[PDB]
Amino acid sequence: NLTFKVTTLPDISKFKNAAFVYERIVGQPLTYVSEGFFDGNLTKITDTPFYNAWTQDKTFVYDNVIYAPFMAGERHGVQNLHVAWVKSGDDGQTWSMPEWLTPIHPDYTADKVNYHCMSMGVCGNRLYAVIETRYLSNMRLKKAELWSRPMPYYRRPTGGITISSGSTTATIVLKKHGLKVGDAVNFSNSGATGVSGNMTVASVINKDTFTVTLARAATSNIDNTGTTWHFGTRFWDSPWEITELPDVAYSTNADLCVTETHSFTVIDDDNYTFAVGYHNGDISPRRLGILYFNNAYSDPSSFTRRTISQEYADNAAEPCIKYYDGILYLTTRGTSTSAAGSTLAMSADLGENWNYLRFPNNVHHTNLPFAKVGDYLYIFGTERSFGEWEGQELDNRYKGTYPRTFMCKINVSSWPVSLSNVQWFNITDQIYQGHIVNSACGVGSVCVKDGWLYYIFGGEDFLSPWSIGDNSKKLWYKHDGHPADLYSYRLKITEHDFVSRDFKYGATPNRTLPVSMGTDGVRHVSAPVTFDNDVQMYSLTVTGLEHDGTQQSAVRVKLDGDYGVIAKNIPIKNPSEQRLILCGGETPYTTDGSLLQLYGSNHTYPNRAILYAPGGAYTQNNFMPYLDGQVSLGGASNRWSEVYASTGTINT
Amino acid sequence: DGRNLTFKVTTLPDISKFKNAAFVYERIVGQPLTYVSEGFFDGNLTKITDTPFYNAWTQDKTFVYDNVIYAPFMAGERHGVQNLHVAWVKSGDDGQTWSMPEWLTPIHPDYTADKVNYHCMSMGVCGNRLYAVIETRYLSNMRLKKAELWSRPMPYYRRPTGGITISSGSTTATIVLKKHGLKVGDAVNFSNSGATGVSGNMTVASVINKDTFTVTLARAATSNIDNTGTTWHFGTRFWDSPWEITELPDVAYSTNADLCVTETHSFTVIDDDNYTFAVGYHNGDISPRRLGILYFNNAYSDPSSFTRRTISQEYADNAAEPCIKYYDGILYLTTRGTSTSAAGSTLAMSADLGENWNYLRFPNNVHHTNLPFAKVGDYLYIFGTERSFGEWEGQELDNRYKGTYPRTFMCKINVSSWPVSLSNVQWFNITDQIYQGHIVNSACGVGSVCVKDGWLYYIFGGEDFLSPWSIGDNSKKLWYKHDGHPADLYSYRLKITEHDFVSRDFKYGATPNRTLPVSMGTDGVRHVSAPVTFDNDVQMYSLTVTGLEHDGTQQSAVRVKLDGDYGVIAKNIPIKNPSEQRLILCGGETPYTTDGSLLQLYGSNHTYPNRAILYAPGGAYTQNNFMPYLDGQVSLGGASNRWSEVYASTGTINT
Amino acid sequence: WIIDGRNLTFKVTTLPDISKFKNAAFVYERIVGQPLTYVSEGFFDGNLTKITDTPFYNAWTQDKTFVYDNVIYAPFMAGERHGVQNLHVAWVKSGDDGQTWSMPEWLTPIHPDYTADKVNYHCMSMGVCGNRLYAVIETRYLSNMRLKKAELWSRPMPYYRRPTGGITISSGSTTATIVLKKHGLKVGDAVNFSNSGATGVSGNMTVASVINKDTFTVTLARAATSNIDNTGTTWHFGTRFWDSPWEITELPDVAYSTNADLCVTETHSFTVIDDDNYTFAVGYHNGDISPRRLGILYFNNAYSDPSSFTRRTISQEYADNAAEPCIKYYDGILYLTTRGTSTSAAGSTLAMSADLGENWNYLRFPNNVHHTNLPFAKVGDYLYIFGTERSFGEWEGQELDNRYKGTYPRTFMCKINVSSWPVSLSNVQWFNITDQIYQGHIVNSACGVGSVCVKDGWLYYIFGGEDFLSPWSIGDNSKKLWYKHDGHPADLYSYRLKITEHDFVSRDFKYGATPNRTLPVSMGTDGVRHVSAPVTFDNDVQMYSLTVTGLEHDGTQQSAVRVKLDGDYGVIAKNIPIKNPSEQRLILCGGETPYTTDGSLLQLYGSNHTYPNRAILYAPGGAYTQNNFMPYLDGQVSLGGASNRWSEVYASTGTINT
Ligand SMILES: CC(=O)N[C@H]1[C@H]([C@H](O)[C@H](O)CO)O[C@@](OC[C@@H](O)[C@@H](O)[C@@H]2O[C@](O)(C(=O)O)C[C@H](O)[C@H]2NC(C)=O)(C(=O)O)C[C@@H]1O
Numbered sequence A: 001n002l003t004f005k006v007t008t009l010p011d012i013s014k015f016k017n018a019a020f021v022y023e024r025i026v027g028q029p030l031t032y033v034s035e036g037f038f039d040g041n042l043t044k045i046t047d048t049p050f051y052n053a054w055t056q057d058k059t060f061v062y063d064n065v066i067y068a069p070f071m072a073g074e075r076h077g078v079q080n081l082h083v084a085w086v087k088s089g090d091d092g093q094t095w096s097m098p099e100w101l102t103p104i105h106p107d108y109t110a111d112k113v114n115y116h117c118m119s120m121g122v123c124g125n126r127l128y129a130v131i132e133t134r135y136l137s138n139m140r141l142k143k144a145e146l147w148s149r150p151m152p153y154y155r156r157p158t159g160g161i162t163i164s165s166g167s168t169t170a171t172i173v174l175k176k177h178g179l180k181v182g183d184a185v186n187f188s189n190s191g192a193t194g195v196s197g198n199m200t201v202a203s204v205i206n207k208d209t210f211t212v213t214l215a216r217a218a219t220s221n222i223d224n225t226g227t228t229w230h231f232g233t234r235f236w237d238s239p240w241e242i243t244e245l246p247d248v249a250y251s252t253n254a255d256l257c258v259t260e261t262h263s264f265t266v267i268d269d270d271n272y273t274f275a276v277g278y279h280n281g282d283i284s285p286r287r288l289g290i291l292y293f294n295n296a297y298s299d300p301s302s303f304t305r306r307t308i309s310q311e312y313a314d315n316a317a318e319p320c321i322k323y324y325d326g327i328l329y330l331t332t333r334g335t336s337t338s339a340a341g342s343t344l345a346m347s348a349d350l351g352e353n354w355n356y357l358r359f360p361n362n363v364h365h366t367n368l369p370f371a372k373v374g375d376y377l378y379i380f381g382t383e384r385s386f387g388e389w390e391g392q393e394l395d396n397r398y399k400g401t402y403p404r405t406f407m408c409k410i411n412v413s414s415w416p417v418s419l420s421n422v423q424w425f426n427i428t429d430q431i432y433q434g435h436i437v438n439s440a441c442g443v444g445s446v447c448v449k450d451g452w453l454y455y456i457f458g459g460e461d462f463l464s465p466w467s468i469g470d471n472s473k474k475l476w477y478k479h480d481g482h483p484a485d486l487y488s489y490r491l492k493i494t495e496h497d498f499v500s501r502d503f504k505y506g507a508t509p510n511r512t513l514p515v516s517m518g519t520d521g522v523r524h525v526s527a528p529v530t531f532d533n534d535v536q537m538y539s540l541t542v543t544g545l546e547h548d549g550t551q552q553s554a555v556r557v558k559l560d561g562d563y564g565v566i567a568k569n570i571p572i573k574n575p576s577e578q579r580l581i582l583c584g585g586e587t588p589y590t591t592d593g594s595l596l597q598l599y600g601s602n603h604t605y606p607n608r609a610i611l612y613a614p615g616g617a618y619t620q621n622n623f624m625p626y627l628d629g630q631v632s633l634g635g636a637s638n639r640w641s642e643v644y645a646s647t648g649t650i651n652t
Numbered sequence B: 001d002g003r004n005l006t007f008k009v010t011t012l013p014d015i016s017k018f019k020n021a022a023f024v025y026e027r028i029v030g031q032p033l034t035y036v037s038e039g040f041f042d043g044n045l046t047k048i049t050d051t052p053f054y055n056a057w058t059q060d061k062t063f064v065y066d067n068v069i070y071a072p073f074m075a076g077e078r079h080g081v082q083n084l085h086v087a088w089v090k091s092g093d094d095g096q097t098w099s100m101p102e103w104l105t106p107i108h109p110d111y112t113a114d115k116v117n118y119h120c121m122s123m124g125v126c127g128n129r130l131y132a133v134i135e136t137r138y139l140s141n142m143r144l145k146k147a148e149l150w151s152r153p154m155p156y157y158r159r160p161t162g163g164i165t166i167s168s169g170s171t172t173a174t175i176v177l178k179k180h181g182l183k184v185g186d187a188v189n190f191s192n193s194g195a196t197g198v199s200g201n202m203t204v205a206s207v208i209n210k211d212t213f214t215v216t217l218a219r220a221a222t223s224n225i226d227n228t229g230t231t232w233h234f235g236t237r238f239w240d241s242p243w244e245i246t247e248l249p250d251v252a253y254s255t256n257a258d259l260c261v262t263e264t265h266s267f268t269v270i271d272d273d274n275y276t277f278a279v280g281y282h283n284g285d286i287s288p289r290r291l292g293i294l295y296f297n298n299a300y301s302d303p304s305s306f307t308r309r310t311i312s313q314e315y316a317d318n319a320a321e322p323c324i325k326y327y328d329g330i331l332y333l334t335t336r337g338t339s340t341s342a343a344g345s346t347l348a349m350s351a352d353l354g355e356n357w358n359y360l361r362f363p364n365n366v367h368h369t370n371l372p373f374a375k376v377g378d379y380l381y382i383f384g385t386e387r388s389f390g391e392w393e394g395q396e397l398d399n400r401y402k403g404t405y406p407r408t409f410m411c412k413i414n415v416s417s418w419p420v421s422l423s424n425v426q427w428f429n430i431t432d433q434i435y436q437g438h439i440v441n442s443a444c445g446v447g448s449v450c451v452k453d454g455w456l457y458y459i460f461g462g463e464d465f466l467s468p469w470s471i472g473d474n475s476k477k478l479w480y481k482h483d484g485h486p487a488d489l490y491s492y493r494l495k496i497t498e499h500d501f502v503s504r505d506f507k508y509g510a511t512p513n514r515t516l517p518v519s520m521g522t523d524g525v526r527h528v529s530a531p532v533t534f535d536n537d538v539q540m541y542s543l544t545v546t547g548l549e550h551d552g553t554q555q556s557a558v559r560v561k562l563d564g565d566y567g568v569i570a571k572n573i574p575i576k577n578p579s580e581q582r583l584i585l586c587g588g589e590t591p592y593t594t595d596g597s598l599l600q601l602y603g604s605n606h607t608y609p610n611r612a613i614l615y616a617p618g619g620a621y622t623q624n625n626f627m628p629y630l631d632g633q634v635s636l637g638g639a640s641n642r643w644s645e646v647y648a649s650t651g652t653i654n655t
Numbered sequence C: 001w002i003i004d005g006r007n008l009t010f011k012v013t014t015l016p017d018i019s020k021f022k023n024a025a026f027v028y029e030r031i032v033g034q035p036l037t038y039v040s041e042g043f044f045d046g047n048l049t050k051i052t053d054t055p056f057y058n059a060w061t062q063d064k065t066f067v068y069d070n071v072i073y074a075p076f077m078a079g080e081r082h083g084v085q086n087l088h089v090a091w092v093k094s095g096d097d098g099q100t101w102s103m104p105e106w107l108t109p110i111h112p113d114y115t116a117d118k119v120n121y122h123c124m125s126m127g128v129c130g131n132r133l134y135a136v137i138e139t140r141y142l143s144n145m146r147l148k149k150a151e152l153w154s155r156p157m158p159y160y161r162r163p164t165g166g167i168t169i170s171s172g173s174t175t176a177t178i179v180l181k182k183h184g185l186k187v188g189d190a191v192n193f194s195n196s197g198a199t200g201v202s203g204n205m206t207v208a209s210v211i212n213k214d215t216f217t218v219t220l221a222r223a224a225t226s227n228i229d230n231t232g233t234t235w236h237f238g239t240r241f242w243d244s245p246w247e248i249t250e251l252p253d254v255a256y257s258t259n260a261d262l263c264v265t266e267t268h269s270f271t272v273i274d275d276d277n278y279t280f281a282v283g284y285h286n287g288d289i290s291p292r293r294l295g296i297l298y299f300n301n302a303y304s305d306p307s308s309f310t311r312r313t314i315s316q317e318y319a320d321n322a323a324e325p326c327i328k329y330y331d332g333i334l335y336l337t338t339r340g341t342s343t344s345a346a347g348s349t350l351a352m353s354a355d356l357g358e359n360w361n362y363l364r365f366p367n368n369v370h371h372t373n374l375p376f377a378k379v380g381d382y383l384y385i386f387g388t389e390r391s392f393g394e395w396e397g398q399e400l401d402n403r404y405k406g407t408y409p410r411t412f413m414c415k416i417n418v419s420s421w422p423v424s425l426s427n428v429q430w431f432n433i434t435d436q437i438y439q440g441h442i443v444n445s446a447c448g449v450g451s452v453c454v455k456d457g458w459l460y461y462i463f464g465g466e467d468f469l470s471p472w473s474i475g476d477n478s479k480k481l482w483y484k485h486d487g488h489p490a491d492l493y494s495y496r497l498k499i500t501e502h503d504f505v506s507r508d509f510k511y512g513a514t515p516n517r518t519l520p521v522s523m524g525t526d527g528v529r530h531v532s533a534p535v536t537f538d539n540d541v542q543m544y545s546l547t548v549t550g551l552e553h554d555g556t557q558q559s560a561v562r563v564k565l566d567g568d569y570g571v572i573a574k575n576i577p578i579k580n581p582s583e584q585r586l587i588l589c590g591g592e593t594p595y596t597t598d599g600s601l602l603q604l605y606g607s608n609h610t611y612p613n614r615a616i617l618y619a620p621g622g623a624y625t626q627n628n629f630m631p632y633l634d635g636q637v638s639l640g641g642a643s644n645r646w647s648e649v650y651a652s653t654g655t656i657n658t
């Protein structure tokens, strides 16, 4: 590669392996790369009409799978919002459908709050997340809870299962299991009678040992020494451990206030020591630092606030934090174009004391997620709209623009003397749509899997949400919905001593609603599906016919609600026909079955009802007029032929 | 590495073994064409629709507006207007990815009664309004019954300062908004106006001038209002605005060759502020042909007023489907040639809005394709596609009824001065498409060109080798049978200026989630987050109707509604045990009386055919008079089904 | 890239940074004594595409791929595990030279006796002969995967012709004779005609008789009234593949047996020897009973005699520890490769026969190639042969299986000159051309088990790979439900390799469309998504509300709108309310809303209602019964009650019948 300084940007697309240093704003050089300069490329990873944004700062890799958690909503607020993730099982080439991790808050309507999250990661084989409850009205933090589950994982251990005759307690040795009482697990081929299939953790003895309860007592002494068996957690069946974090909430007291929790890093995996970033950007003087948890497994409510110096917390927010080899690294977001901005900091004593390096030129509006690879920090940020990156530049909103994403690479083999000469590289450009002031661009997160690093972050497209227009309600299903979606910049960070794993995708996408063309020539959908909105269809047959050909005897339509309504719309063609016909046979004719016809108010004879039952109409129970002494049985032109009763005297 | 140089070869080499090279080759003696390797042009092809409809004919409707690229086309089933919608797909990312089709016209309201439907090859934007010539054509023979100019305000956003005034006691608010393009009745939206009563969704009440309109307040102002100094937000509501629809006199088939119109095609603006524009047209039905433009001097104030301006007969003979574009006082035009054995496509220009033309015939009888183009700097970039392989060259015969790889071509004509001749025109084969082969018709080409910033787009048709089986089991041309129709759209995106920015490109690795947006819920089930209408028969294993919305609000009333003149809920003949056939309606959760009252209607196949039985442990009641339908014929009880006792206010039966 | 290797090969001590090279290859001994070659981008003009993406366990193209009338077919099985539970034989297809691939189409239904007999279908041998599709459709036990029986299934291929002349009818006859060369049709096959120029020969018809290879008849709806001969008329013909019954023929003794000479473990691979005479071969082996047998089933004329075949085996030396032959016939020579079944015994062998499988010449691959079939095609003088290890590091001879953790198994290709048949394969050069993923949470791997086909200047190795998303069989999904979580990670890939000069401008495109074939959606002028195909949901559906419209695409509105229920009986029921259980009831309405001002109503109250289990009929226009109306029990049910007296009773006779 080669880098040189230009007075004007050249035709960048013509070149390879080149980068151009250019001062768009005088005195603020940035470097613009051509293709081939870095071995990195951008992939779009969500494409839904929700406002999908804010991976900050939650990405992680676990058991070969890359997780990109984010929030799927409709605006910069918690209206209709789920904390969610998408995942990649192919090193970031393709990404799954969004999965909601939080439900809509149970008190959404009553208390006008909903969930939110910017801090999530894995520690000691458990997922941890700071799930915040925020007000719909003003986005203030009402309270915050640490949520945890055992991660989804698989083990193939040998031995370690013992049960005494007469006991219902089975003891299971499983190193660093990370389980808690009540967690859901599964066993196969255990070689220990009664320890099989789906079970629940009954007790935890130590880091490597737990118990489960058998349905019935063992009738011999059991020890599966020598037997190789299979174990899996059941993440989706395990109750979340939910622990309120005291004083983590909005407050008008500057020393209590928390604006956001953000970022997560493990200090000691086996002892559940980790840190969560936080700041107060609501009440001066600001505070920014970490919440340090000495042992989140045994004491999930116990943490201490460890802050950075005031002059680096001023005009700052949203620390990204990562621990490596005894050193905790931190970057901040600057909150003003006209004040000193983002800072890089490190601590060798778990946040009690820091060394600081300010980035020059008031880096602002972006968090700066990063990873350490070898001797370098790879640090990324994205401006919200074109031309806002440079210090002192004004916001550029309300028109469509191409915001720049930047990366720098800082050698920390020893702590740098200064970042005055930092070289930011513009590595990709995104789109800011422009018809609302808010931008989803950036607000990202960095993770690493083997020889690839991922900066996973937001960008938009030029299709308007029409908030100003016919969609002030921000309905995602109207027109093009919201243009905020996620992208992944995947950068090579080590030698790739293997032949390519890459592929082009040429398949029919078939996970969201899996369709196969049947031998009947019709599309079959092979998953249960719930439609959250109004559905119309040309005709409906309810089949009771499953995949393997089993035909149910009872075919069912069920209605929820306080009451169910099956009704007949006013006809468009011939309103005088209006009626609902319920049929015991295949067609609405008495040769095929009994029928009940309920006529509507538009019918020629409005609101009549007629029962047709050639085989006889029967009532199992007493049959009466609703009101006493008012309703006739038969009529003057509709006399029953004869009345049959056990007594021939009418009771008056 | 050919260093962007060109070679003349006796036979085509292994083109995939080179970059930045082009090869001049005469497949047909005397008719050289140039074949490019990767890299010769900074251009690439993207497939932009993938639906089982017959999706074809962007000609000549594409446009770019407020950063979005629009590719209008027709989605139907054949070369005809059966089942067809005028539609578009759009790109919000410079042509990398494209939206679901949106239908712009409904099926014609008189489709069945009058046997006609809509059609469009002319659409564009003038003065912040969408304009289209929406044709009504006969299903039987495709003849043009009538044509209408349709317009709406474009979807757009503004952020103005000041300009809203209201006098005390008035219900009229006056809105200054430059070049608004609105008409009375158009739908708009306001936010943060700083003017009481001017807020949310409103309708244009009157238009005062090009820069000023009014809206009507729900109640009279109680003071003089002027939002001077206030910055506010404005948006049109395109989809809520009525179309203005204007019949175009004599734009229809006619046996009079001076009236007859075969097709309207292409659109270009001459003056945006004064709504002056032209639409291409030709008569290819009645000799002598006519070809030229419909010129509208002011389509805003007088949408029905236009004049015909034709090219000369010499160049109208054997021609059709003019593409027209206006730049800096000059109207440029290309034609489609209609015969392999007569002089073909012509390039022309007019400095007087079509009253006179300067002509340049392309050599070698270019035919069967329209030639859409754009001017960029001193050059016209002109594109065309053969319908099937080997048809491009003059005098070549049609090559249908087998699968082939038709070539797409581009030429680049320097018009800094008008050329002396096109005899030396260099056509570059820039991409190859597929013609499927099992029907004579081809959707290849029939395209359109538009430009956004440093990219030009040729958006056009191609097929694939999957048969529609029109000869086979699908002569009805049902799109949902087998693979439907192979016609879909493609976009060739070509760099046409310096790109002084880092790449905006990305690879698409997302789960596509716009057509039926699905998320996996915390319940472990797929949730679909949009209303959906199924236009065909649906079957399902079981159904629960929930009344449960996204935010968790649960409706008290859960509803199943049936349209039609009458609604039928019926029980098919059982496959396993026909003698059980019955429908059970239940007031509780299961069909047992411990859970609720039940009505069972037995079918004709039941062991006890055609019985009805009502189960109501809490009592069965009728609010109204309850009678036999026939008089004197129906029994109440029976000899072995006696009521225990009868209770009535009078003990005398009325005979 | 930094270094242009200029298509040269380096011998290296350890693999370098391969992604920094183009046009380069590296010979490396991961295992000492077993060199393999690793390629950078550009070394071969070949690239990988993912071609299925569904949550089923989609695997085993082996060895069924083929190209017909410009379309590439990739048949496979869509199921849930290494077994036939819930499984369909299926295919996906490409109409654009392998760039994009269709939704799966099920070719076999679930076996009609799946529940009663506990068996289901399976297939590893399929192809085209004489314009018909042929497949050996196996019936296997769910419990142990043994082969119960096997059937030869065939249909005419979907095809189109544009002939001239050839249709004759005698006056007075209802038989039309159709000349169509090598039609491949059988009696009962479904066809379609257009523009025949022969009265009565039009539209959808059925084959009535077959006269010879080039001639068949159809029956007219009425007798011709003149002598008809459409000589000089150009017309149109299509088969109707999907409307033609399958010809299904049992293959005697192709089944599990404890007799080593009858036992068939699998039928596998297909190749045509003579298209016009319907001579073809199907591979097979017995790997269940020692001594093993491996070879071909040779069908001399499958059209006239689909049940007639002979077994032709390779020598015991090369059948031992072997399975799953891939077989291909070219220019009078039949080539065969085997799968090796042990890492610690001599493995895959390449063989050729000049006499249709009676005698073979053999070449053992060195180093115990095992666990993979080796599909191939011949291009010029060379066989291009492909295989994939099941998990990383299993390829080399003697290496142990490496399961139960996620890994990146290697795919390999070699190129063997068979015009000059080698003396030995000792110096075979295997190239690692792409790497797949083995997910790791179950022992079984879908990687490989592939098939090779060719279209013009491109060769396709179409085969399996996984991804790292677990199926949770150990976890909450031991039932292997595809619709739970991410379903199964097994899906198909196509490695498309340039094999001739490409003397044309690129046909390639990037895909940037909204995928819209599975459930075709358009945004309507009503601002709602419309789905433009019939759809059947095989699982439970919930929806917020439902309107049944009777309104079709062209705007035609049905007078009768229909909801129908299958089953023995249909149930429409009211669940227990979550908000206010005391309201529980179902309201059936003749008008649009549940109020008597809009229509008659029948209200059925639930057991949780304030007044449990009542039924009330509201009929302001009068309630009528056409038929006799009676209590179900005799002498037990009252008509009216003490506080619910009818005003007056009207009957033709005033005496109650007791
Ligand atoms: C991946 C998977 O499905 N694993 C399951 C496993 C498999 O079905 C496998 O084929 C057998 O290892 O079976 C598991 O259940 C074993 C269980 O069915 C029997 O061992 C069973 O176990 C008892 O429940 C018990 O241990 O209390 C009692 C019972 O008498 C006994 N039945 C028989 C015939 O032995 C397993 O291996 O644990 C469950 C896995 O989910």
Ligand SMILES: CC(=O)N[C@H]1[C@H]([C@H](O)[C@H](O)CO)O[C@@](OC[C@@H](O)[C@@H](O)[C@@H]2O[C@](O)(C(=O)O)C[C@H](O)[C@H]2NC(C)=O)(C(=O)O)C[C@@H]1O
Pocket (backbone or CB within 6 Å): B470, B471, B475, B476, C193, C194, C195, C196, C198, C199, C200, C201, C202, C203, C204
């Ligand atoms: C692709 C396709 O739809 N092909 C059909 C084809 C075309 O509709 C077109 O009409 C070409 O002829 O029509 C086919 O049917 C035409 C047939 O209905 C008429 O020829 C009709 O048929 C007779 O009844 C008959 O042959 O028995 C005789 C009768 O006089 C005649 N009626 C008229 C008005 O011509 C075809 O060409 O076969 C069917 C194709 O599916």
Ligand code: NA
Pocket (backbone or CB within 6 Å): B055, B056, B057, B443, B444, B460, B461, B462, B463, B487, B488, B489
């Ligand atoms: Na097309």
